[PDB]
mmCIF file of C-alpha atoms in Angstrom:
data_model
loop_
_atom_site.group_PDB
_atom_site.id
_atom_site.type_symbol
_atom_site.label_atom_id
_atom_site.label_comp_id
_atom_site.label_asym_id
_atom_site.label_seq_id
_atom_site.Cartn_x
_atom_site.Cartn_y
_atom_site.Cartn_z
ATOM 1 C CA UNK A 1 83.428 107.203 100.706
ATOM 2 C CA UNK A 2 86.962 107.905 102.244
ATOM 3 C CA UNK A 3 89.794 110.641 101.251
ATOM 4 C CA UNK A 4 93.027 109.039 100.419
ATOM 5 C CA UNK A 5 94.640 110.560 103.698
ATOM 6 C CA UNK A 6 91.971 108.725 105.501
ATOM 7 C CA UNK A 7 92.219 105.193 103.518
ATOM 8 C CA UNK A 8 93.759 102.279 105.060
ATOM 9 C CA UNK A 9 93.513 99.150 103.100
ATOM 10 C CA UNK A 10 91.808 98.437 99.470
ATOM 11 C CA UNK A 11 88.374 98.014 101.639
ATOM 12 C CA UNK A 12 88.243 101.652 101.782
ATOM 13 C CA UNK A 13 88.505 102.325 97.636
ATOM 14 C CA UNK A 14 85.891 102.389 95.082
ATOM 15 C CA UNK A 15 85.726 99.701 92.656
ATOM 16 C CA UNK A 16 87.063 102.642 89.853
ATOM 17 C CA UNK A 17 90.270 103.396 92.628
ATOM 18 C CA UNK A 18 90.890 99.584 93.527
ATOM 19 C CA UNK A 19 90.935 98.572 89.463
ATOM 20 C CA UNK A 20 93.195 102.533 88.904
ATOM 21 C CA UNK A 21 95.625 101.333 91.804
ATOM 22 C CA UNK A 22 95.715 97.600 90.562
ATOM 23 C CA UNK A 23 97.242 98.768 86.984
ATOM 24 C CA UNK A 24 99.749 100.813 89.076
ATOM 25 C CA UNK A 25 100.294 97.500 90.628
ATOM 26 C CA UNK A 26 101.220 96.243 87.416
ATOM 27 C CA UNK A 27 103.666 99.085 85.942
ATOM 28 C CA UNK A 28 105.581 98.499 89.318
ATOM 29 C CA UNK A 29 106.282 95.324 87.670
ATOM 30 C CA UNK A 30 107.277 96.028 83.909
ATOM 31 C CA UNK A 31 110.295 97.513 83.172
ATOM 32 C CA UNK A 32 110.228 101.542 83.183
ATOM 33 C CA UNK A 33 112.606 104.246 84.726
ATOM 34 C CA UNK A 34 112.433 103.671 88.394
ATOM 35 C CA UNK A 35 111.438 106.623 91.209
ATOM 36 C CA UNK A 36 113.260 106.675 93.794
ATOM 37 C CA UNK A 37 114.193 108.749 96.653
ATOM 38 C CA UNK A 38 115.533 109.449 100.323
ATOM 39 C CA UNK A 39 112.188 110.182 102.492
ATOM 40 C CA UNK A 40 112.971 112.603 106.062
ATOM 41 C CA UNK A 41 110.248 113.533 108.384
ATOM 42 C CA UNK A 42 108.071 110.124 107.655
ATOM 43 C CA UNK A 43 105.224 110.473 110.676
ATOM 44 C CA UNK A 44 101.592 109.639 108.821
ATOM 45 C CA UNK A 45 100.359 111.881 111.247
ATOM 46 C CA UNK A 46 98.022 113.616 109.108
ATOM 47 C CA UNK A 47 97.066 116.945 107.562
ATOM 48 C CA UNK A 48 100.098 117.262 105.650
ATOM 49 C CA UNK A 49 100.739 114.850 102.576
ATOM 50 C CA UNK A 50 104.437 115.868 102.617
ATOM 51 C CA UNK A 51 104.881 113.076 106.020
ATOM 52 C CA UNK A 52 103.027 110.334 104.300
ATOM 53 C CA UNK A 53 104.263 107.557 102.117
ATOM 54 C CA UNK A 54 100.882 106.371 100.499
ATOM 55 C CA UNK A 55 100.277 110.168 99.376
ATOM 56 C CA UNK A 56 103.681 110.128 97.383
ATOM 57 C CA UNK A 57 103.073 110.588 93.642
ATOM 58 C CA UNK A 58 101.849 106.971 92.162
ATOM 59 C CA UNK A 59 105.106 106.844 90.061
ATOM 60 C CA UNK A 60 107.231 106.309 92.727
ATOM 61 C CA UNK A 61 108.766 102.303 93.342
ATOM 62 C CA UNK A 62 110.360 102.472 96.565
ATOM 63 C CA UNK A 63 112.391 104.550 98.974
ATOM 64 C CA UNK A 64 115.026 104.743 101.206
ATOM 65 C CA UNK A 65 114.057 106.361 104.916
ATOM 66 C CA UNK A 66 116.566 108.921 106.082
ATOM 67 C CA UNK A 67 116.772 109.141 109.598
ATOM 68 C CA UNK A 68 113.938 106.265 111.140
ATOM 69 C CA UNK A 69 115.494 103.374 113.092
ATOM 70 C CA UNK A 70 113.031 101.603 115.103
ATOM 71 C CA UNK A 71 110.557 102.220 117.559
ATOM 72 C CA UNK A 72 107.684 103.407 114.488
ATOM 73 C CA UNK A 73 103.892 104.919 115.371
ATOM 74 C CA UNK A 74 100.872 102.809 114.594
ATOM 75 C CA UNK A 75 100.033 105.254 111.799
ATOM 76 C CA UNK A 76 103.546 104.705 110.373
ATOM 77 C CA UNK A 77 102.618 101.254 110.484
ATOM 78 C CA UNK A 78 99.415 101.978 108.256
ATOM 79 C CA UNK A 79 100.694 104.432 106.418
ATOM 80 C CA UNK A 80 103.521 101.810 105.573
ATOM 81 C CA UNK A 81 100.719 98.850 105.012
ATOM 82 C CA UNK A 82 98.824 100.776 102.497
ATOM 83 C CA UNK A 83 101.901 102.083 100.262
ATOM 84 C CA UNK A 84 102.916 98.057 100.459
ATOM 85 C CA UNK A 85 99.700 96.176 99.421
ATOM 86 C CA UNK A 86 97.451 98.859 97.323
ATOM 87 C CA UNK A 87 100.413 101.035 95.859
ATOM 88 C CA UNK A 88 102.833 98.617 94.611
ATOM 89 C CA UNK A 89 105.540 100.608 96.860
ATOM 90 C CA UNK A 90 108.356 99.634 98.988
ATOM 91 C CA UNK A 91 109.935 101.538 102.534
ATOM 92 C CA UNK A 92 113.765 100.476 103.177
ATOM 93 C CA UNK A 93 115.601 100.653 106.091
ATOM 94 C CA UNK A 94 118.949 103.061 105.089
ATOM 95 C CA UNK A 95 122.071 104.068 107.402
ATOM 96 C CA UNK A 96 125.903 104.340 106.609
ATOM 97 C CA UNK A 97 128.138 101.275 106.754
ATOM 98 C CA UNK A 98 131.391 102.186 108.461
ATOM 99 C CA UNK A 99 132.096 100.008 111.618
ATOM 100 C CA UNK A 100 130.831 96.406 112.849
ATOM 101 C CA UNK A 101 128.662 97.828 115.011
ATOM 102 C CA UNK A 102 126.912 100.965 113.625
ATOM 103 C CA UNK A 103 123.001 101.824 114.917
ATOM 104 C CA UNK A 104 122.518 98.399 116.746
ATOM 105 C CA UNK A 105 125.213 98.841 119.176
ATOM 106 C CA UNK A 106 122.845 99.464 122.226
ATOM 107 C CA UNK A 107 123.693 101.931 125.653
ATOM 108 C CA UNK A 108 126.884 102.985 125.237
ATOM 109 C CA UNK A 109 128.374 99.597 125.317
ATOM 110 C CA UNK A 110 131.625 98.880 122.962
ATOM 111 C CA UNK A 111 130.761 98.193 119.248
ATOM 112 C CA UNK A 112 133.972 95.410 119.135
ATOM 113 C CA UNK A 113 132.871 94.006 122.517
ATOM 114 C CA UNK A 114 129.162 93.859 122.544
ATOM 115 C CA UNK A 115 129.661 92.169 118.328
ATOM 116 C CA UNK A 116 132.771 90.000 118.369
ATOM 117 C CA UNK A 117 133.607 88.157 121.672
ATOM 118 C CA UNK A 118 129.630 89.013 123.273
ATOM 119 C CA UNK A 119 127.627 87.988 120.047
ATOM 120 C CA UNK A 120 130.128 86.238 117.726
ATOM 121 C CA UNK A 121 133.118 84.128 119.932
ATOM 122 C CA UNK A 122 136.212 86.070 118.600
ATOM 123 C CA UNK A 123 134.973 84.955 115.440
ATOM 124 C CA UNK A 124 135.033 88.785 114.229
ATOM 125 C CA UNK A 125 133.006 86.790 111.428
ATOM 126 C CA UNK A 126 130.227 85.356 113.472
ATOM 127 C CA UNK A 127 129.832 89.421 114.695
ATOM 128 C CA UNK A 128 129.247 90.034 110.890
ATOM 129 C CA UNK A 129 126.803 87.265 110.374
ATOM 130 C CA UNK A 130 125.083 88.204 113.794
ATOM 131 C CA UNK A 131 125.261 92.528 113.011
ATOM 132 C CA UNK A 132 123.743 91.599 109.601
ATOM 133 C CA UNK A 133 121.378 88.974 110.851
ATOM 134 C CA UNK A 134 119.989 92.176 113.373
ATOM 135 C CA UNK A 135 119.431 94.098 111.000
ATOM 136 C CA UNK A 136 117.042 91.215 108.661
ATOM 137 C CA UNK A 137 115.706 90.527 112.141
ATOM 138 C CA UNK A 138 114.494 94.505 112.613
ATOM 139 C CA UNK A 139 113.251 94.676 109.306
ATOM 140 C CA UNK A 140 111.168 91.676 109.470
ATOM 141 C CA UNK A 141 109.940 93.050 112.950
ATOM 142 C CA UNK A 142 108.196 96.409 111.047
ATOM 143 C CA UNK A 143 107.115 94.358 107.550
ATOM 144 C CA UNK A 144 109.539 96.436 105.746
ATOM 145 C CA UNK A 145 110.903 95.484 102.156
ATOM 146 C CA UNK A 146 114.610 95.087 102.752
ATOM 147 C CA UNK A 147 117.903 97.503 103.859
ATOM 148 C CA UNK A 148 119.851 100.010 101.483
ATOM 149 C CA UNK A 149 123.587 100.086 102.268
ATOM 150 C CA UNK A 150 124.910 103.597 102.411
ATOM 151 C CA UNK A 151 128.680 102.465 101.471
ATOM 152 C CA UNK A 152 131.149 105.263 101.535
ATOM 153 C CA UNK A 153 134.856 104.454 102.554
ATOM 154 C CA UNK A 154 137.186 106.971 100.696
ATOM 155 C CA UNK A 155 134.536 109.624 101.066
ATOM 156 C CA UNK A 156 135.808 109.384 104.966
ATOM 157 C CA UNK A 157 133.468 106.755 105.433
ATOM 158 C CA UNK A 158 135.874 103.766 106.157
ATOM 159 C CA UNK A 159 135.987 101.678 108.689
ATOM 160 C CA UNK A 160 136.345 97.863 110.358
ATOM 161 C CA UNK A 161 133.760 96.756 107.707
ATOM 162 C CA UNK A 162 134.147 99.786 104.821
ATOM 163 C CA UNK A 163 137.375 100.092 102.997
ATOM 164 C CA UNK A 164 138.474 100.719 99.308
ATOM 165 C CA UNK A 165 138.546 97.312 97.907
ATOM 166 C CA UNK A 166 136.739 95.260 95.862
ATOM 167 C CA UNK A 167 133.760 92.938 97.849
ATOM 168 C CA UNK A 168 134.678 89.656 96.856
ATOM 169 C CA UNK A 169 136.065 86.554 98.944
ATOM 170 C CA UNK A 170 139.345 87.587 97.195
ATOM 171 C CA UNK A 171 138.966 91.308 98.823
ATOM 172 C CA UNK A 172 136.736 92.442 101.225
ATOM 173 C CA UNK A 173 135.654 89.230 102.226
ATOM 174 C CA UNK A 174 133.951 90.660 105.689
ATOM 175 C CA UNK A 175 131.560 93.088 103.377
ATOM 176 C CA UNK A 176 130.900 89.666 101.501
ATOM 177 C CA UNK A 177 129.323 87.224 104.360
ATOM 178 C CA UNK A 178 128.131 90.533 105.246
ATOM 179 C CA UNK A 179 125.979 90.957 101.512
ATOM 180 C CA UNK A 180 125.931 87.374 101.522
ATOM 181 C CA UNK A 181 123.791 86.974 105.194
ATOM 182 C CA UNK A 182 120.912 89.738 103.998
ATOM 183 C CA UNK A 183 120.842 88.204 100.836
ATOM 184 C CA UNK A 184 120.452 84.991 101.776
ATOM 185 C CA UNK A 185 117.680 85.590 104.339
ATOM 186 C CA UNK A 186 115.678 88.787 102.519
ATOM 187 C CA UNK A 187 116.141 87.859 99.065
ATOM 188 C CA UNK A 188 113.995 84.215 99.625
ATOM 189 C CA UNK A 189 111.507 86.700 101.570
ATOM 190 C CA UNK A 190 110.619 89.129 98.493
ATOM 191 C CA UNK A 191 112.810 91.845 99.992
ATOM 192 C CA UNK A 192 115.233 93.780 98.288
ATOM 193 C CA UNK A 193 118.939 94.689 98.852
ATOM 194 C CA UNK A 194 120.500 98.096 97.600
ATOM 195 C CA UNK A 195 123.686 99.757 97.703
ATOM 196 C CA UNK A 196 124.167 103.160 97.771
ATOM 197 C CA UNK A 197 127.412 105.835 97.364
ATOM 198 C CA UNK A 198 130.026 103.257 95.576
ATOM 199 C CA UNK A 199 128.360 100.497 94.589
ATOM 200 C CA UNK A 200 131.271 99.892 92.157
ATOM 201 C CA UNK A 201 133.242 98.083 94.929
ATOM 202 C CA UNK A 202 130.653 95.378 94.076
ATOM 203 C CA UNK A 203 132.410 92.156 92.913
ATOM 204 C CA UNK A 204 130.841 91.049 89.445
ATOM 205 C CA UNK A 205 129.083 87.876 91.619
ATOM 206 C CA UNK A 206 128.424 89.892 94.310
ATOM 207 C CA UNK A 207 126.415 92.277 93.051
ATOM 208 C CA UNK A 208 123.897 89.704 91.630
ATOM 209 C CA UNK A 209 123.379 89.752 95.398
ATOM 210 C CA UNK A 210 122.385 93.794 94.955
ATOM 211 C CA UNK A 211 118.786 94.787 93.870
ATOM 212 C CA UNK A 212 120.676 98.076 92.219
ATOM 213 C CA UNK A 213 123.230 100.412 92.694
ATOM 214 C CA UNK A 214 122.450 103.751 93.537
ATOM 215 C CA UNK A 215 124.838 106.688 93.099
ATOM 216 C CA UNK A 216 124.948 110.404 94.362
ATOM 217 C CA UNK A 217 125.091 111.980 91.321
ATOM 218 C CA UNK A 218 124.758 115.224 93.080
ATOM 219 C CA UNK A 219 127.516 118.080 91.396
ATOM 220 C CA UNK A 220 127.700 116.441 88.107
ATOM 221 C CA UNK A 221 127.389 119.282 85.590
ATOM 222 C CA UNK A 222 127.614 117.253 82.190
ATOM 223 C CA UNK A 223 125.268 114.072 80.622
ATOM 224 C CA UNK A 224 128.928 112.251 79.972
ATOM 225 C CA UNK A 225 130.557 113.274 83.196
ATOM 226 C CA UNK A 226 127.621 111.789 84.959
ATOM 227 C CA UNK A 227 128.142 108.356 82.214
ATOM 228 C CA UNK A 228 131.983 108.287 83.867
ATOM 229 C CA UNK A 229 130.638 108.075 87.219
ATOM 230 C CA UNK A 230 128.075 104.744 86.553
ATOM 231 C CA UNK A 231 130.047 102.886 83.534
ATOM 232 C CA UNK A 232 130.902 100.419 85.291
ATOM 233 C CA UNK A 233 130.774 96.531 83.328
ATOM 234 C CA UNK A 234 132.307 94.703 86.733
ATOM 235 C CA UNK A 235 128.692 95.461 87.538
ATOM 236 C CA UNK A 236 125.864 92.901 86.628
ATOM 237 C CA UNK A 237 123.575 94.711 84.491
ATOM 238 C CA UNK A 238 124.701 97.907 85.273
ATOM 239 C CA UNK A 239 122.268 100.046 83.075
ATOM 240 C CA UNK A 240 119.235 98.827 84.381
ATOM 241 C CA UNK A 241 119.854 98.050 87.763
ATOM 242 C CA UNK A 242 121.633 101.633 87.883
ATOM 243 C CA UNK A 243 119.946 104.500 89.970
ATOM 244 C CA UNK A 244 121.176 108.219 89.544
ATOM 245 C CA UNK A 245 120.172 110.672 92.450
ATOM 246 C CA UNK A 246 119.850 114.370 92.448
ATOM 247 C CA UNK A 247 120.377 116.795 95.746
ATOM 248 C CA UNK A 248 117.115 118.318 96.760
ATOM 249 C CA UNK A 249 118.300 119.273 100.498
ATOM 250 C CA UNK A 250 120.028 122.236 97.923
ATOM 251 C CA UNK A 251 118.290 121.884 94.761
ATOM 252 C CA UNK A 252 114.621 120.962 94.874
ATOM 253 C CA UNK A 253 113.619 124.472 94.031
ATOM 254 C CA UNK A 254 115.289 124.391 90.611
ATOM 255 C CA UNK A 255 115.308 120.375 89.700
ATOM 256 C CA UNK A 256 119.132 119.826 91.216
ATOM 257 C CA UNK A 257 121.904 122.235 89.738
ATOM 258 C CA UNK A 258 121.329 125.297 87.835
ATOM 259 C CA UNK A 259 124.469 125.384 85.408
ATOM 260 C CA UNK A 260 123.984 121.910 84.109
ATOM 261 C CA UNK A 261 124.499 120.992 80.356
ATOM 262 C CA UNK A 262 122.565 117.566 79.280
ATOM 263 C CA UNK A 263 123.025 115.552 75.682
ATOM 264 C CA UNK A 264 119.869 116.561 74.602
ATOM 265 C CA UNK A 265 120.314 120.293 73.589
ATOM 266 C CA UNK A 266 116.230 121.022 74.055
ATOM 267 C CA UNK A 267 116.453 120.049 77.459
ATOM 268 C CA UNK A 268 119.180 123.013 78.335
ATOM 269 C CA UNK A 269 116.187 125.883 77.193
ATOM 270 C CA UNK A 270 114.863 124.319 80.353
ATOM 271 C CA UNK A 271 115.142 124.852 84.138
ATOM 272 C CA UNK A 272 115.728 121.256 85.878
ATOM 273 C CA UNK A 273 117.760 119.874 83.099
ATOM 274 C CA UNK A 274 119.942 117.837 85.615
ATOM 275 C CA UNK A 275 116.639 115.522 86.668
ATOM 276 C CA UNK A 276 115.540 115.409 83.160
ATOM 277 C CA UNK A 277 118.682 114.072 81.954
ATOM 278 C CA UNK A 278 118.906 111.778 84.434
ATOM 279 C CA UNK A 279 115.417 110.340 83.604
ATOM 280 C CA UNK A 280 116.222 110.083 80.085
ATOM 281 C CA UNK A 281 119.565 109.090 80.120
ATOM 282 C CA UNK A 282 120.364 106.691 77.255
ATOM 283 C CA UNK A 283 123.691 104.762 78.299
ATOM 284 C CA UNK A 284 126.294 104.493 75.467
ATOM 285 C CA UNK A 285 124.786 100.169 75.108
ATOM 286 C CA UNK A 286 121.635 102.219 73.805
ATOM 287 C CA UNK A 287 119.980 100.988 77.396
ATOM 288 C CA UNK A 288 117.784 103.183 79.275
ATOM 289 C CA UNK A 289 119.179 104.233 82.872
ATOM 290 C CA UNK A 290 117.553 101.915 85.704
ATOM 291 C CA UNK A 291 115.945 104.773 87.763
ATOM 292 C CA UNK A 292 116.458 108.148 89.308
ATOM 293 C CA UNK A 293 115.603 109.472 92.756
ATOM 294 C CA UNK A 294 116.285 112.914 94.930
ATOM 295 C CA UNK A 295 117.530 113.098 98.309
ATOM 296 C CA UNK A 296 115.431 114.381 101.023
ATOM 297 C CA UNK A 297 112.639 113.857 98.390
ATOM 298 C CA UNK A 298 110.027 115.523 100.220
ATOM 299 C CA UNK A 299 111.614 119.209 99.752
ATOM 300 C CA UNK A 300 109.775 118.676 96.159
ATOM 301 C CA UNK A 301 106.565 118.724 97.851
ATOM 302 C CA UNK A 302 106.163 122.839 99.012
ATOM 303 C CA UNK A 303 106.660 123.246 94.809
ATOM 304 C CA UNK A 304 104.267 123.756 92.594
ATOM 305 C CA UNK A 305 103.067 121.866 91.652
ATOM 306 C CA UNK A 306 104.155 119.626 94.712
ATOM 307 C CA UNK A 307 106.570 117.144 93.652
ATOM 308 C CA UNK A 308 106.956 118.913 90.354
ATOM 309 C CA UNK A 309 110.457 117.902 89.404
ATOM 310 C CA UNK A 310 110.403 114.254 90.439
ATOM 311 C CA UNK A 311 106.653 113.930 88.786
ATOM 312 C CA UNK A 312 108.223 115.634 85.526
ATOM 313 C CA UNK A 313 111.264 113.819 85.500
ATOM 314 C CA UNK A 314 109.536 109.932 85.608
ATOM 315 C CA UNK A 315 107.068 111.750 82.738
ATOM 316 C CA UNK A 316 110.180 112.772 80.484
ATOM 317 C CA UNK A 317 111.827 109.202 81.640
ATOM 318 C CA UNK A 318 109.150 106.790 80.693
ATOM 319 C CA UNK A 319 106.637 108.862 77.915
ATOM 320 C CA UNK A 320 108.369 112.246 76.477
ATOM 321 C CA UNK A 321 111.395 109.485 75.916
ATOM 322 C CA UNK A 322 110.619 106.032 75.770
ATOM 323 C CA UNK A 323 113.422 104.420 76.509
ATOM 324 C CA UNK A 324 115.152 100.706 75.723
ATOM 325 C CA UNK A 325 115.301 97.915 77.949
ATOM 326 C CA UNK A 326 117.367 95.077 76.366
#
């Protein structure tokens, strides 16, 4: 007889919560709109549900954590094991992908010297296979479900891995054995890979390698300007595997912008029409739009009712709308 707060592991449920959370289990698993989002202040310290992953609404996949690194609490770790194995939920690692060295680099020692000569041999490449490699090995070290490349070069982003071009051996080919390394060692592992900002860079075969492609579709103030932005057939499977974000740092009050105009007339009576759209956003193939998410999800949570827009949004996305998925 245990609280959710207070519950650790399926041991502490209720045969009626352990069967409820075991279909939840199984919707994670058929194909639906996606929920999504970019999680700051994650402690699972307690007394406030807003810090806690497991006490995110029931309708939401996985996320992306803005800001945490390493070094996590015990009670992250819990907090963490419960979301995992009872909710059907997944916590990825998440930080912009600029230089070589970026967030591993320890001290201050030199990102080119500590990666290339130090860790590969001058084989800049080895330094690739060895940064990625790190970051698989600090993933595995917490049990979390995989890494979600923030890839922005040409948003002033660019650097001795990021740059404009197509990530193919024909382009980018450092980005590639760079994809290629986490794929190869978190894909056989269950994990997931996700790219996040212009995941149209993607190569067709290279973004088999990418569990879906997540854009900012932050200041987008039209259903078909937001279509422009995402349309995008170099893509495998671009409509489901597609993830359209709102900004909540700005916009969680009023469900992202306030002068947007959606496709769907009846939705523009409406405050929140941006997230609504998103959710329901038939793609010109007649396919359903893979997911949506918010950044800095939790500014959702003081609403009311607390997580109102994302909570409405996956309800207009996968009942008010059914969408199609083939």
């Amino acid at each position: 007889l245990i609280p959710l707060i207070e519950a650790q592991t399926e041991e502490d449920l209720t045969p009626t919560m352990r069967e409820y959370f075991a279909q939840i289990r199984e919707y994670r698993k058929t194909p639906h709109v996606k929920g999504f989002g970019w999680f700051g202040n994650w402690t699972g310290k307690g007394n406030n549900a807003q810090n806690y992953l497991k006490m995110l609404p029931d309708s939401v996949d996985f996320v992306s954590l803005w800001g945490t690194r390493g070094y996590l609490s015990d009670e992250q770790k819990a907090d963490l094991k419960f979301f995992q194995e009872v909710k059907g939920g997944k916590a990825l690692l998440c930080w912009i992908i600029q230089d070589l060295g970026d967030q591993l680099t320890p001290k201050g020692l030199n990102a080119t010297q500590y990666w290339v000569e130090e860790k590969g041999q001058g084989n800049f490449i080895e330094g690739v296979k060895a940064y990625a490699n790190a970051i698989c090995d600090s993933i595995e070290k917490y049990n979390l479900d995989g890494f979600d490349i923030d890839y922005q070069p040409g948003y002033g982003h660019s650097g001795t891995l990021a740059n404009y071009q197509t990530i193919s051996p024909s382009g980018n080919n450092k980005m590639q054995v760079f994809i290629e390394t986490l794929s190869a060692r978190l894909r056989p592992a269950g994990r997931m890979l996700v790219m996040d900002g212009q995941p149209d860079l993607l190569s067709t075969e290279t973004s088999k390698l990418v569990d879906h492609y997540i854009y900012q579709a932050y200041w987008e103030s039209s259903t078909s300007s937001v279509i422009y932005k995402i349309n995008k057939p170099n893509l495998d499977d671009w409509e489901r595997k597609t993830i359209i974000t709102v900004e909540f740092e700005q916009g969680w009050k009023t469900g992202g912008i306030t002068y947007y105009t959606s496709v769907r007339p009846e939705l523009n009576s409406m405050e929140g029409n941006q997230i609504l759209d998103y959710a329901t956003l038939d793609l010109p193939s007649g396919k359903r739009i893979g997911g949506i998410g918010t950044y800095h999800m939790e500014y959702d949570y003081p609403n009311d009712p607390p997580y109102k827009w994302l909570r409405k949004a996956l309800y207009f996305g996968n009942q008010v709308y059914p969408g199609k998925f083939d």
